[PDB]
Amino acid sequence: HSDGIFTDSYSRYRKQMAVKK
């Protein structure tokens, strides 16, 4: 099961968060 925050993209988008700071 997955849904954005729970999948791959988020895993790669999550970190991107801090990075974009």
CB 19 within 8 A of CB 13: no
Q: State how far the Cα of 4 lies from the Cα of 14, in Å rounded to an integer.
A: 10
Tokens representing 2? 């997955």
Tokens representing 17? 């968060």
Q: State how far the Cα of 21 lies from the Cα of 18, in Å rounded to an integer.
A: 5
CA neighbours closer than 13 Å in the CB half-sphere of residue 15: 4
Q: State how far the Cα of 7 lies from the Cα of 13, in Å rounded to an integer.
A: 10
Query: Which approach determined this entry?
Result: NMR
The dihedral region occupied by 4, where left means phi > 0, alpha psi between -120 and 50, and beta the remainder, is left
Scan for tokens 């990075």, then name that residue. 19
Q: State how far the Cα of 13 lies from the Cα of 4, in Å rounded to an integer.
A: 9
